[PDB]
């Protein structure tokens, strides 16, 4: 279709610049680089969210230990906030899975 658009632009009388197989090789290079970079970055984001959830469980254990230890009246609100944090984090992980499943065509077109 790049060839076809170039041919139609030449037919219409406008200026045209020739398309070579070097352009296709550069396109494949861009595809590979963009796919690898974006997939690695987003997979690192997902793994970091999982590690953060593990650290949230560890800090829930830590604040339970602090509960075991007039400055001890924050844990109820803390757990109430962290439950919603966990719910929004698992929803974000589901949307992460969806964008992992759709990232290929986005990378190709870009």
Resolution expressed in Å: 3.3
Task: Give dist(CA 64, CA 61) in Å, integer.
Answer: 5
Backbone phi, psi, residue 15, to 5°: -70, 140
Q: Which two tokens stand for residue 110?
A: 């870009």
Q: Which two tokens stand for residue 28?
A: 């494949």
Sequential DSSP letters for 24-42: HHHHHHHHHHHHHHHHHHH
Q: Which two tokens stand for residue 87?
A: 């719910």
Task: Give dist(CA 63, CA 13) in Å, integer.
Answer: 74
Q: Tokens 């595809």 identify what position?
A: 31
Q: Which residues of 78-107 are buried (b: 16+ CB within 10 A; e: fewer)?
A: eeeebeeeeeebeeeeeeeeeeeeeeeeeb
Q: Which two tokens stand for residue 58?
A: 């560890």
Q: Which two tokens stand for residue 41?
A: 């970055």
Q: Which two tokens stand for residue 27?
A: 């396109």
């Amino acid at each position: 279709t790049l060839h076809q658009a170039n041919a139609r632009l030449a037919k219409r009388g406008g200026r045209t610049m020739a398309i070579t197989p070097r352009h296709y090789l550069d396109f494949i290079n861009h595809y590979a680089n963009l796919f690898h970079e974006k997939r690695s970055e987003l997979e690192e984001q997902q793994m970091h969210l999982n590690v953060g959830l593990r650290k949230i469980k560890e800090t829930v254990d830590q604040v339970e230990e602090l509960r075991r230890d007039a400055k001890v009246n924050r844990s109820t609100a803390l757990l109430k906030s962290l439950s919603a944090e966990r719910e929004r984090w698992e929803k974000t992980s589901e949307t992460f899975k969806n964008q992992m499943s759709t990232i290929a065509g986005d990378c190709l077109l870009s």
